[PDB]
Amino acid sequence: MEAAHSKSTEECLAYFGVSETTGLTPDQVKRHLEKYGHNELPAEEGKSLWELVIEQFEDLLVRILLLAACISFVLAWFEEGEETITAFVEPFVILLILIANAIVGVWQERNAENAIEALKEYEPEMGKVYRADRKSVQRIKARDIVPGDIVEVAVGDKVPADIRILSIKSTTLRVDQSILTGESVSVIKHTEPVPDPRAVNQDKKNMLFSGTNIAAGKALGIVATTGVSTEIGKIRDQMAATEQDKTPLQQKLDEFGEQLSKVISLICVAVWLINIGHFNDPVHGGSWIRGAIYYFKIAVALAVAAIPEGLPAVITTCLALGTRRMAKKNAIVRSLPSVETLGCTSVICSDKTGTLTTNQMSVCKMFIIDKVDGDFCSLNEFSITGSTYAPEGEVLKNDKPIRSGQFDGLVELATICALCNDSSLDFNETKGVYEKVGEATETALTTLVEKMNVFNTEVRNLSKVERANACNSVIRQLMKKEFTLEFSRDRKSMSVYCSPAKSSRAAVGNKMFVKGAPEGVIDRCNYVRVGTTRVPMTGPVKEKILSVIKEWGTGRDTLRCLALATRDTPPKREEMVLDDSSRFMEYETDLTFVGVVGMLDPPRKEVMGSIQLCRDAGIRVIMITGDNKGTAIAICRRIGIFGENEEVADRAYTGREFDDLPLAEQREACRRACCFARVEPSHKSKIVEYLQSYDEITAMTGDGVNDAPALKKAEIGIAMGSGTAVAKTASEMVLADDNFSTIVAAVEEGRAIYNNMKQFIRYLISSNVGEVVCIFLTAALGLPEALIPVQLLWVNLVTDGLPATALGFNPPDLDIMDRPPRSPKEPLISGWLFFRYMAIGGYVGAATVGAAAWWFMYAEDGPGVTYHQLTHFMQCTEDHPHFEGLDCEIFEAPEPMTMALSVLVTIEMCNALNSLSENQSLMRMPPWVNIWLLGSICLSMSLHFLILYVDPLPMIFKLKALDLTQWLMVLKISLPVIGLDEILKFIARNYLEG
Ligand SMILES: C/C=C(/C)C(=O)O[C@H]1C(C)C2[C@H]([C@@H]1OC(=O)CCCCCCC)[C@@](C)(OC(C)=O)C[C@H](OC(=O)CCCc1ccc(O)c(CCCCCCNC(=O)OC(C)(C)C)c1)[C@@]1(O)[C@H]2OC(=O)[C@@]1(C)O
Ligand SMILES: [K+]
Ligand SMILES: [Mg+2]
């Protein structure tokens, strides 16, 4: 395996010591394979149902629950025969929760798809090699190809390994590197080595990357590297080495787990400490077993009271909902947990072309020199109407319409555009529109031609179909395209050698038409065509040319410029070696400049404002383009990244400038920069790590497989709907319309989602707090079980689940986007808020406990044990002659529990209205504000009633319907909550800062 692109064909045949005609010898193959391994990507990690299930049972809370599920299972295995049969329902349900919860997690992961797996979609199953053991070619399994052996590839074939090309068996070799480099059009490959050893893939012209397809031709080559060592394998590793943090809310959930675990434990110790006097009781097992059973069944209750068993159910459903809500807006969220992290984006890095602009090129300014008379000079600027690739528009000089033909200079310019260009136009009748056939910038020159047909060649009486390439093909027939010197990033330009065809044109026969970067080509021009004549390119004329070139790329126009020239006396045909990108630059010299063409890549409509939104939203936007920084910066000003007069010294760098900086300044640059032009692949990944060293949540756009590494490391990777599948499977979200503004819209829903989501979480949590309080008093005072596990779960999954999810539909704040990005480390409940719930729980804990006790003593239905130990109720059948002239079974009664459970239920509907706003009073933000809320509160109540009356139910919950007067008591107990909160809110509102 090597750096073959820089090495020569021999040197490579040398390195491996393999014969180009024999290939590797069967021995060499065994040796080579055992030294370089199979040519395939690392096997998938092996996870089994077992591990997968065990993982479900790793969470701390899930364990705490599983444990209680047993104390319960055993306790229920100790009931009194017929006194109870429903005994086994408490433990059975907890399991269903855990069983359910597991089943989810597993189905969740089975349906998951690995971004690293997608890559394997780019590995051919078979390949063709030439080995010593046979004369003819052999079609083996890609996996068995080895670095060194000879391989031949042809059209259709997907490249197997990273190959250095030895000799092209065809006239030309075209490859589709789209995925790995991002060049839609098939490029041309050669055999000559590339000097630079640190070259980027795009410039390795003698290289075949594994996974890319061969568009046209057939060639032979020696395998540079295989497996994880190939260009794609290097990506697989960056991705496999990339580790992703958990959603801040996912973190908070682990945080809350550890903590709850502590508290519960302390509660136990406290509870034990309270009932310490028991160490001063007569020594004899007077319910030694009846007392332990008691605590254990309080333990299990205490557990289901502290854990919000329906919260993950609610969050998952709120996320799924908003998700669809976004889909309608072209934002396809792949992972639900992300809708949150999205909301916290502080930096968005977007590619320019496909997303910030339309990528729908069009030329709207031309200019040909009009006169050179020493120092005096005058150009001929023009403007061209139309943004579409449609052959409709006109040409104007000072806004005044013109027939292009009248200018000789334009007749030349025009041809160059049709001849040099490989692209073309087509018109699909189904959609009734003109379509770009080749590349955006060339296919533009195509429509430019059409719109200015120099010869007036009448075409009006044509259909749109044929109208598409009319004026080009006109010029296509005039000259004969002999051969083309393709584009090369060194000389930044391409050309075409042309013959006159039919005689009478013989004189000035062979010509050479060039088009490339202005500074580039113009420095190679010794002449300038003024009409049909020519004149020595002089300094004055050159300054004037390069001056206009800058107003066009730097001015409010933000135009990309193409210099069009011509070599009048082109080197003799045979004196040219048409297969070495290196010499083409030398063949494209001694040129006479004819004129430049300025085209535009219009920014999308909804982009300007989207950029403004981010300003208000405190989100930094960083552009990633291919433009030079001169125009890059212009485009950045045009859309809003920069002000029109804003300084940009240390806020816009280039791929080189950046690299030329020491790791320190490099880092410093990233916290201020915004426009990054001509950026290599490695970069996207460095810029992310730096933005991270500043604790920022960044977003990164990408389309191809080369972006996957970066996308997988950005907090939120955004893939293009039009982009590769690997890219998509690597990102958290996808943009159907590839439109940057879709990103922003997405971020806003994230802030909206987390806001509502925020509340129902605070809501379900407080209720769990109050539930615990109840249990704590129940045991701290030795009272009869006020609330039972079975009941609690109902209230936690259903009675509170409905109000909870509804709170997810709270009307969004109007200023959501006028506030900076949320801090991930922001706790959900602290300070003053902590206290309110500290007080609310403290309340319901009292309301629930007391509600039940009040039935025992003080009620007309219940036996007033009033101000006498209801508490020592356990020692009762024995001690009855003392303080018990009644039946020791009242305590098992349903009325009492059915009391607390009702006060709990009504207090949780009341606390659901208090959760409509953290600090706004209901008198201000009335409950009717959120209809869904009220509706569910009805569904909930009726559900409560259902389990009270419909016969089968009451029995299992240990609940007996209570009459019209007991109910009124529930109200006199619950309702005060609303007031307690209004007060506590009023405090926040008016004294404590805020
Ligand atoms: C909870 C109950 C109790 C008793 C408790 O003691 O709770 C503790 C506790 C741990 C807290 C404290 C509270 O302290 C007390 O109540 C003291 C009073 C004790 C009185 C004793 C005598 C009566 C909270 C609560 O107190 C107050 C006033 O809200 C405040 C905070 O809660 C938060 O922010 C929440 C937002 C973060 C947060 C965000 C997302 C979440 O999903 C969660 C909780 C849900 C985790 C998953 C559970 C659901 N299901 C599940 O796991 O598995 C299933 C699906 C069931 C299978 C929390 C936390 O401070 C939290 O610990 C944290 O790390 C914080 C800083 O989050
Ligand atoms: K990621
Ligand atoms: Mg790209």
PDB file of C-alpha atoms in Angstrom, residues 492 550 553-555 558 623-637 642 647-658 661 673-679:
ATOM      1  CA  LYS A 492      -7.681  26.890 -13.771  1.00  0.00           C
ATOM      2  CA  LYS A 550     -13.186  43.006  -9.431  1.00  0.00           C
ATOM      3  CA  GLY A 553     -16.915  39.772  -8.141  1.00  0.00           C
ATOM      4  CA  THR A 554     -16.597  42.171  -5.206  1.00  0.00           C
ATOM      5  CA  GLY A 555     -19.440  44.598  -5.855  1.00  0.00           C
ATOM      6  CA  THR A 558     -21.260  39.114  -6.344  1.00  0.00           C
ATOM      7  CA  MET A 623     -20.568  29.807   5.312  1.00  0.00           C
ATOM      8  CA  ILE A 624     -18.542  27.120   3.583  1.00  0.00           C
ATOM      9  CA  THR A 625     -18.014  27.859  -0.091  1.00  0.00           C
ATOM     10  CA  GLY A 626     -15.777  27.207  -3.075  1.00  0.00           C
ATOM     11  CA  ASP A 627     -15.697  30.825  -4.206  1.00  0.00           C
ATOM     12  CA  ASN A 628     -12.457  32.721  -3.666  1.00  0.00           C
ATOM     13  CA  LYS A 629     -12.625  34.777  -0.467  1.00  0.00           C
ATOM     14  CA  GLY A 630     -12.877  37.972  -2.481  1.00  0.00           C
ATOM     15  CA  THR A 631     -16.296  37.076  -3.860  1.00  0.00           C
ATOM     16  CA  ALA A 632     -16.984  34.718  -0.943  1.00  0.00           C
ATOM     17  CA  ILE A 633     -16.976  37.753   1.339  1.00  0.00           C
ATOM     18  CA  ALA A 634     -19.161  39.579  -1.206  1.00  0.00           C
ATOM     19  CA  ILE A 635     -21.741  36.782  -1.121  1.00  0.00           C
ATOM     20  CA  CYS A 636     -21.508  36.848   2.681  1.00  0.00           C
ATOM     21  CA  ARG A 637     -22.403  40.578   2.628  1.00  0.00           C
ATOM     22  CA  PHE A 642     -21.569  40.549   6.942  1.00  0.00           C
ATOM     23  CA  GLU A 647     -14.676  44.882   8.524  1.00  0.00           C
ATOM     24  CA  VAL A 648     -13.755  41.227   7.928  1.00  0.00           C
ATOM     25  CA  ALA A 649     -10.003  40.932   8.500  1.00  0.00           C
ATOM     26  CA  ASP A 650     -10.033  38.086  11.045  1.00  0.00           C
ATOM     27  CA  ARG A 651     -13.501  36.762  10.182  1.00  0.00           C
ATOM     28  CA  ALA A 652     -12.951  35.096   6.810  1.00  0.00           C
ATOM     29  CA  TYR A 653     -10.177  32.644   6.000  1.00  0.00           C
ATOM     30  CA  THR A 654      -9.304  30.271   3.213  1.00  0.00           C
ATOM     31  CA  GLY A 655      -8.359  26.604   3.377  1.00  0.00           C
ATOM     32  CA  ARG A 656      -4.712  27.601   3.007  1.00  0.00           C
ATOM     33  CA  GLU A 657      -4.592  30.696   5.223  1.00  0.00           C
ATOM     34  CA  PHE A 658      -6.126  28.587   7.976  1.00  0.00           C
ATOM     35  CA  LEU A 661      -1.801  29.130  11.111  1.00  0.00           C
ATOM     36  CA  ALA A 673     -14.832  33.578  11.479  1.00  0.00           C
ATOM     37  CA  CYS A 674     -17.944  33.275   9.326  1.00  0.00           C
ATOM     38  CA  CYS A 675     -16.889  32.930   5.724  1.00  0.00           C
ATOM     39  CA  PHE A 676     -14.564  29.956   4.970  1.00  0.00           C
ATOM     40  CA  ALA A 677     -13.720  29.670   1.259  1.00  0.00           C
ATOM     41  CA  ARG A 678     -12.070  26.981  -0.825  1.00  0.00           C
ATOM     42  CA  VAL A 679     -12.051  24.506   2.018  1.00  0.00           C
TER      43      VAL A 679
END
